From a paper:
The biocatalytic reduction of the oxime moiety to the corresponding amine group has only recently been found to be a promiscuous activity of ene-reductases transforming α-oximo β-keto esters. By studying the crystal structures of enzyme oxime complexes, analyzing molecular dynamics simulations, and investigating biocatalytic cascades and possible intermediates, we obtained evidence that the reaction proceeds via an imine intermediate and not via the hydroxylamine intermediate. To gain more insight into the reaction pathway, we determined the crystal structures of the two enzymes OPR3 and XenA in complex with the oxime substrates 1a–c, either by co-crystallization or by soaking. All the crystal structures obtained had a high resolution (1.9–1.35 Å) and showed clear electron density features for the oximes.
To assess if the introduced amino acid exchanges affected the overall structure and the binding of the oxime, we also crystallized the tyrosine variants in complex with selected oxime substrates. The protomers in the crystal structures of the tyrosine variants are perfectly superimposable with the ones of the wild-type enzymes, confirming that the exchanges did not lead to major structural alterations. Interestingly, the binding mode of the oxime substrates also did not change in most of the structures. The propanoyl moiety of oxime 1b points into this cavity and is likely stabilized by hydrophobic interactions. Substrates with an acetyl moiety (such as oximes 1a and 1c) give the non-productive binding mode described above. Testing the tyrosine variants for oxime reduction showed that the exchange of the non-canonical tyrosine Y370 to phenylalanine in OPR3 led to significantly decreased product formation compared to the wild type (OPR3_Y370F). In comparison to the wild type, the non-canonical tyrosine variant Y370F of OPR3 showed a 4-fold decrease in both kred and Kd in the reductive half-reaction and a 3- and 2-fold decrease in kox and Kd in the oxidative half-reaction. The effect of the Y370F mutation on the oxidative half-reaction is a clear indication that this residue has a role in the catalytic mechanism. The non-canonical tyrosine residue Y370 was shown to contribute to the reduction of the oxime moiety most likely via protonation of the hydroxy/methoxy moiety, leading to the imine intermediate.
Author numbering: 10 to 283, 297 to 385
Write the structure that this text describes.
Amino acid sequence: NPLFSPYKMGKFNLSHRVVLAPMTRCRALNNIPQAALGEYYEQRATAGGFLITEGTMISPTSAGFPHVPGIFTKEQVREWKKIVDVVHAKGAVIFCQLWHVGRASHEVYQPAGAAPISSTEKPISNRWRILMPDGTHGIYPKPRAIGTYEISQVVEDYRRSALNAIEAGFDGIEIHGAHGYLIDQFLKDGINDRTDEYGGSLANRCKFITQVVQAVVSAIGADRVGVRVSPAIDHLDAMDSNPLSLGLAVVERLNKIQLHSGSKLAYLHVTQPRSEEEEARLMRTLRNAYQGTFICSGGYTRELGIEAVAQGDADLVSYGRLFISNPDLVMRIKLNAPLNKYNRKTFFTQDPVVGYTDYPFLQ
Ligand SMILES: Cc1cc2nc3c(=O)[nH]c(=O)nc-3n(C[C@H](O)[C@H](O)[C@H](O)COP(=O)(O)O)c2cc1C
Ligand SMILES: COCCOC(=O)/C(=N\O)C(C)=O
């Protein structure tokens, strides 16, 4: 089973290739990591296994879900340290995903009820609805298009949050540049209509992600930085006219950051949408173009994960939904044991136990 061959992710020695994908679960009440998160990640941690946290706020304006953790205050850093310690006690490696939602927010999630920020004033269309704190669904509002000074402040928010993650003991961070959130709102020409130096050309649309990655690399070192993108996922009205070219442009800029820094990033992490042959070709083209470690995600199974590693399509495979309901997913994949079903109704509820830590281990 090639999923259980070791892998050197830079300075981290992984014992197997099964990764916990980042998943928002909304149990971090008031944006403060809670003890329940420690139990949840501890259940899924394995010796030499790699975990990526739920998306984590970089600033008071970065959220678009209820009760998601932040890492921009010292109180948040203190509580994260307790969780990181219990994960490290099991021998796992853990990265904190840094997440700004941009226009994918609502007045209820913003300080003083202000408008969310974005590359443009275009809202997500009414085809999509936002989960509200009371469990109903609301309307995405028109965002405020930020100028270049404010862009530089957001870059600094990523940098400070990366330093805070290291202070909490995280092994590294992942930049969430996928799924139609803030970075993707600059990348995708279906959203970014700017006429300044951050819009127009493919090069200009890639400027923001380049500056973010450069800032965190300078702060904590390239080998502690992963980058997640999704050029071919259209979530929240985030489409590009040429997804493969957009993806290769991002890959080119990551390759150049590495040469400039004299070090490789921890990895490139790409979601696929789920013809199948074309979509796999898109993924393999990005993998082949990138000088480093490649993590694939999106609809993977035991069989598909084994085939991805064996055929050289990916170095690591991340699993989301099956890790929700199978705390021992790594062991079950190793043994080819039957998997437990997941309950979508409790993906984003606030209960510290129900649908969170009460999925059973293998019987
Ligand atoms: C409940 C839930 C929350 C998610 N939250 C995030 C997130 O915070 N950050 C992120 O990059 N992806 C997020 N995603 C996507 C997952 O990381 C992953 O790509 C996806 O679940 C992989 O597909 P799979 O569930 O078929 O394994 C989330 C997915 C789910 C189901
Ligand atoms: C198209 O698949 C959905 C992609 O968006 C996500 O997975 C996500 N965060 O990135 C959440 C919080 O749901």
